[PDB]
Amino acid sequence: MFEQRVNSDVLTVSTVNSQDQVTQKPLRDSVKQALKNYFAQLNGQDVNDLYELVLAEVEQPLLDMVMQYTRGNQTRAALMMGINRGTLRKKLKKYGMN
Amino acid sequence: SDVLTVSTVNSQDQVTQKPLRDSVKQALKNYFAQLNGQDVNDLYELVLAEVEQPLLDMVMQYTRGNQTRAALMMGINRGTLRKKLKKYGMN
DNA sequence: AAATTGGTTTGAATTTTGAGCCAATTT
DNA sequence: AAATTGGCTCAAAATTCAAACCAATTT
CATH class of the missing domain: 1.10.10.60 (Homeodomain-like)
Known part of the structure; x- marks a missing residue:
């Protein structure tokens, strides 16, 4: 009667996908993308x-x-x-x- | 000035950075909205x-x-x- | 008027940290 | 074969916590 809501789908963000459809993706992924961009624009500096x-x-x-x-x-x-x-x-x- | 950003797209297919804290805020607004006076x-x-x-x-x-x-x-x-x-x- | 909250202490409990030591692993 | 890391213990430092008051504010 109750569908499972996984922890990663509790805090979610609106996104646009390859078929220009609005979908909810986890906030974790936002954190991932932010960090990935942070690392990418580091170019070998110490953190x-x-x-x-x-x-x-x-x-x-x-x-x-x-x-x-x-x-x-x-x-x-x-x-x-x-x-x-x-x-x-x-x-x-x-x-x-x- | 903002070291931690994510990528957004608008209706004109332009891509733009936005602070991660905006994502967090959105996620929380949504969280508080989906539950109706249920306790956190x-x-x-x-x-x-x-x-x-x-x-x-x-x-x-x-x-x-x-x-x-x-x-x-x-x-x-x-x-x-x-x-x-x-x-x-x-x- | 009654109930709740804010602002502030105190001291215990929990967490984080640094240092050490050596086998294990990478270089 | 040298240098570095992983895993563990140990003590200190630092942080979090509850609990306790009472003025201030909300109900």
Whole structure:
């Protein structure tokens, strides 16, 4: 009665395919393509912060949306994110969203 | 100025970069839309898992399996890396 | 008025990290 | 045969966490 929704199809992105049809593809693939383009435009330079880079790039919208969803309520936001309220406050401060 | 971007196409078949954070935002708007006041519980682990896997796989590809160099690239400890690889069953 | 949240501490629990050591592997 | 990496343990550092108050805000 309930069709299986795989974890990769929970957070998805609209795309256009070879028959110009709009389809949902996983966000993972977006991350993959971004990283592939990042590597491709590197041309042999040394990296030491890739994790923090991606993490910032993903934490910022997440906090933005969850704060919009809860209408500024840090406690609910922290409770639905599954993190400590102090951690959430820390992160909010880190990205100037206080 | 934006190091992490993805490719988009418009109705005029022009291709253009866009920050990855826009994708993440879209995905979340869609997520919040599909569920109707159902409760969210572990959204951080959700997204973090959706993002850590392709990162590890791509960095492991770029370094052809060299965990030490991968770890150096990412800026985390090699132990942390082994742990994350274990977590997502990539070892 | 009552309930909830924000802002802030404290100290324990968990995670991350660095260093070491040597077999195993790559160079 | 030299140099580097993988796997593991160990201790420190750093981060996350709950829990506790009470003023401030929302209901």
